């Protein structure tokens, strides 16, 4: 109906006006007085050399020592990052895998991809082998991200426009989130696991409520698909990485963009995004085979992490902030300290 | 300078790498094909000749083939088409009898043009199957080809129309030097449809081997 369209456009205008009114001073002009961090140099401490194809995802354990990586050769590998040992190697039923996760307690891992199914594996069994514990079906598109809430809950985002919160004990969708108009490509859990954000292919991001399920606020400003998202350690901000060669910082309380991280010599899209322990540096992986470290408060390139011969697809930072691991479309992972 | 447990862990790790190497060597000896179509082209009968992705395995002349059918993935093609960069060849199915209406031939042409000229599929050759040819002869006998192709000047004979369709499909590739297109008339015939695939894949493998040498 025309009345619905008029009401929607009026509400959009009012939201834009309120957002403009709530802005009083840019973050950069406030911050400029602080001391810059200067050059940041990181050396490849370790190189993990097991896979045989492109690496699409990785995750860190909560003990900052064990990590899991997934590649398109149909293998899940758990590494001891201190000594580069292979603790486990899990063969997948389907070789087209685009996501990976590690349980907070260390008992389980998760997987998923083009087969529209999330698989849960039991690492600590009395039989001495790793076996699949539950297969969660019900998505009508490929799986793009998954994150554990605890040993019995998990939240997944798919390319079928929707997100869902599962229940591994029974395998049923407890809640479903439906407000996007394109594929959902990324996910990020809040520190207290009460909210989470999603980055979709309609160049927008939304903030959900896990307990009951509904979109609280939506944040716009990008120009193309959002490929990565991550929460600020404070839990009151997040950063997105899209395909127009830019990264942005949004704040929940103000409900407004804060800063933009772009440069003229970069024209390729961003594949992954993560912060540092104090929230001062913002790391981002690019398609030009480099990872760029950004002064998150001044949008200045502090450093560059150039050691990969192909596109960097995954990127994570340990829980104690002591190391950062990158994977790329060659079969190697690297640890930078 | 390692304790007993550390030495045992290193031994277990090394066994893991040995198994991974064996699995990779086994997997490298296989032919991976990607099957594409316009939904009603006849990929089903092609599969008969030999919820997400669908896989099909078959063997011909001591060679192992793997065919991946992406037909139920109704999402953005740009977001997962780079997974298949590296397949040996792409099998494209188009029905010669699907020029009636509901346009369908033009949709097939658009899909072929988009897939053929892609960043990832710059070197992967294409095997084209123009199936349902008896229906095509029946349709030609009654209706002329000018409905789908208004700018056509030739006799209403099966051979001429089939050659015109093949040429109009084959002239859609811009990189006429890095890529090759093999065309076949399926008709739901006997097996040549696997012999033709075997020949095309052998040519692709010979060219890849010559590239690996350095002469190309």
């Amino acid at each position: 109906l025309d009345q619905l369209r008029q009401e929607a456009e009026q509400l959009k205008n009012q939201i834009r006006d309120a957002r403009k009114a709530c802005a009083d001073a840019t973050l950069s002009q406030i911050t400029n007085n602080i001391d810059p961090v200067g050059r940041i140099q990181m050396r490849t401490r370790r190189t993990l050399r097991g896979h045989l194809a492109k690496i699409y995802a990785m995750h860190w354990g909560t003990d900052s020592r064990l990590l899991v990586s997934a590649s398109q050769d149909g293998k899940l590998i758990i590494w001891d990052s201190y000594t580069t040992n292979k603790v486990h190697a899990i063969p997948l039923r389907s070789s087209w895998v685009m996501t990976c996760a590690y349980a907070p307690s260390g008992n389980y891992v998760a997987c998923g991809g083009l087969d529209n199914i999330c698989s849960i594996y039991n690492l600590k069994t009395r039989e001495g082998n790793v076996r699949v514990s539950r297969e969660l079906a019900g998505h009508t598109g490929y799986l793009s991200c998954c994150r554990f809430l605890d040993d019995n809950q998990i939240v997944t985002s798919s390319g079928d426009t929707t997100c869902a919160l599962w229940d591994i004990e029974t395998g049923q969708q407890t809640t479903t989130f439906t407000g996007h108009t394109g594929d959902v490509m990324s996910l990020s859990l809040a520190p207290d696991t009460r909210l989470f954000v999603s980055g979709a292919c309609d160049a927008s991001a939304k903030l959900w409520d896990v307990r009951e399920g509904m979109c609280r606020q939506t944040f716009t400003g990008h120009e193309s698909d959002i490929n990565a998202i991550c929460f600020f350690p404070n839990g009151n901000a997040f950063a997105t990485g899209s395909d127009d060669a830019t990264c942005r910082l949004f704040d929940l309380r103000a409900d407004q963009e804060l800063m933009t991280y772009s440069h003229d010599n970069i024209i390729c899209g961003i594949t992954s995004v993560s912060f540092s322990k104090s929230g001062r540096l913002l790391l981002a992986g690019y398609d030009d085979f480099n990872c760029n470290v950004w002064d998150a408060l001044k949008a200045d390139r502090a450093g560059v992490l150039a050691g990969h011969d192909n596109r960097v697809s995954c990127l994570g930072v340990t829980d104690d902030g002591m190391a950062v691991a990158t994977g790329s479309w060659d079969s190697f992972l690297k640890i930078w300290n | 300078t390692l304790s007993a447990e550390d030495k045992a862990a290193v031994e277990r790790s090394k066994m893991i790498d040995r198994n991974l190497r064996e699995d990779g060597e086994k997997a490298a000896r296989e032919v991976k094909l990607l099957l594409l179509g316009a939904g009603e082209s006849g990929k089903s009968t092609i599969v008969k000749q030999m919820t997400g992705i669908v896989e099909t395995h078959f063997t011909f002349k001591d060679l192992h083939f793997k065919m991946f059918d992406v037909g139920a993935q109704r999402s953005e093609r740009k977001k997962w088409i780079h997974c298949f960069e590296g397949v040996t060849a792409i099998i494209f199915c188009v029905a010669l009898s699907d020029y009636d209406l509901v346009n369908r031939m033009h949709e097939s042409m658009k899909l072929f043009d988009s897939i053929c000229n892609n960043k990832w599929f710059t070197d992967t050759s294409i095997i084209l199957f123009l199936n349902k040819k008896d229906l095509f002869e029946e349709k030609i006998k009654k209706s002329p080809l000018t409905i789908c192709y208004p700018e056509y000047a030739g006799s209403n004979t099966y051979e001429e129309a089939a050659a015109y369709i093949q040429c109009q499909f084959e002239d859609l590739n811009k990189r006429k030097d890095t890529k090759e297109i093999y065309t076949h008339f399926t008709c739901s015939t006997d097996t040549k449809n696997v012999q033709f695939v075997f020949d095309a894949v052998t040519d692709v493998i010979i060219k890849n081997n010559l590239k690996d040498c350095g002469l190309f």
Partner: single-chain antibody
Amino acid sequence: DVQLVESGGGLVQPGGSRKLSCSASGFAFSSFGMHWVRQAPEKGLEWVAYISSGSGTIYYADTVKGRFTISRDDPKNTLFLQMTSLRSEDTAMYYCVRSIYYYGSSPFDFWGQGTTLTVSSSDIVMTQATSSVPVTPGESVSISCRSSKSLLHSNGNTYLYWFLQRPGQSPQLLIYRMSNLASGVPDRFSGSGSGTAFTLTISRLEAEDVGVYYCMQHLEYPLTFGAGTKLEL
């Protein structure tokens, strides 16, 4: 069911050539390193031989080196100990312990049933001091075990293990690496201590906790066992 069944032991003449078979059913036998542990009647445990996963590493005890031979058959899920030229010092009950080694694993968790055999008539030293102490239900007691060399390693691990043997049964793991509780063990057990001075406490003791308590070392082969403190009353 992770049971292990051992058979082939019995009365032997001196200089015999008896061999024992250990059959496994209920776990991935190919990925577990298997030990052989004996026990003289009026004595304590004593490690004998070890064979790794993939059969790439084999270690023996000085007492039986050159006289006992160990082997495994992965497809048949059997563990062999072929021994030749027996003597009167080998009369003991033999166990078939299993162990898997990766980062965070718990070796020496499941112990076999024991097959008795009777024969016709730079090593770390662990001292357990006390050999008997009476206890009462509802009380808390502590057991001490001392090592000749510092078990603490340069990577921070203190390789010390605790075992409990109920009367007429097989020992079961309690603590591994001096602090970690074994799976299924009640929480009333706790372990602590530093290099060359270790202490296991049992707070709020109750029944089914009596028996003999041992300590072991996994820093370097040959592995050694303590004398054992018997808990009664």
